[PDB]
Write a protein that binds this ligand. Structure first.
Ligand SMILES: [Mg+2]
Ligand SMILES: [Mg+2]
Length: 231
């Protein structure tokens, strides 16, 4: 029986397009009048952050603030603009102003509440991530919020999923995990016995669909999967 449904954040609850806008607005603020295209700075940021962060996948937790500050330091040195003071605060303000949920999120979360444990798992620092969920208006819709800072390891290390399950009080066999990353989300959660749902909104990850138990393009399909699993 499925008693718990856990959600990834970025690309699952939190819009990738909204995240791009957030990040572009950060770059615009950082640069000011510096004669660099903010979109080009953003493109370079995304490359470095992907690589720097891929080195931490499954590894012991390190504050993401520190990792991203080091990326920005490299970018400032590369392009010649002054390293921005209070970068973290700029980023938090931009995320609260421009971050966006996918349109079905509130409905889906509310539909599961009262029948299942509703959880979110964030590969992030706890205070900023929780304040962002609060700004988007959904912090209190969750029975549990679990983070890499709490578990001590980044996805797909099993500890973050183990902790989420403990908060819900069930073993993995009783839970579903929905995420958009085949290896870090589907593979990671399967390692604890969870039922993995790969969210492929644009149908662009077919070559990785066999890494998950179910594939969906819209979070409204999740409750139908859970209902069927429960008879
Ligand atoms: Mg994601
Ligand atoms: Mg995350």
């Amino acid at each position: 029986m499925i008693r718990a449904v856990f959600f990834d954040s970025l690309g699952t609850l939190i819009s990738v397009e909204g995240a791009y806008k957030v990040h572009l607005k950060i770059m615009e603020e950082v640069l000011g009048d510096y004669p660099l295209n903010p979109k080009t700075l953003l493109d370079e940021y995304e490359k470095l952050a992907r690589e720097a962060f891929s080195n931490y996948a499954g590894k012991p937790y390190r504050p993401l603030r520190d990792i991203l500050e080091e990326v920005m330091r490299k970018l400032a040195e590369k392009y010649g603009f002054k390293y921005p003071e209070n970068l973290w605060e700029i980023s938090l303000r931009m995320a609260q102003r421009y971050g966006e949920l996918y349109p079905e999120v509130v409905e889906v979360l509310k539909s599961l509440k009262g029948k299942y444990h509703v959880g979110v798992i964030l590969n992030r620092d706890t205070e900023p991530a929780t304040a962002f969920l609060d700004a988007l208006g959904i912090k209190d819709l969750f029975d549990s919020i679990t983070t890499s800072e709490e578990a001590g390891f980044f996805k797909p290390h099993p500890r973050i999923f183990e902790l989420a399950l403990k908060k819900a009080g069930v073993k993995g066999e009783k839970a579903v995990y929905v995420g958009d990353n085949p290896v870090k989300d589907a593979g990671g959660s399967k390692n604890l016995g969870m039922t993995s749902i790969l969210l492929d909104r644009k149908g662009e990850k077919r070559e990785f669909w066999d890494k998950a138990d179910f594939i969906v393009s819209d979070l409204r399909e999740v409750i139908k999967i859970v209902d069927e699993l429960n008879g």
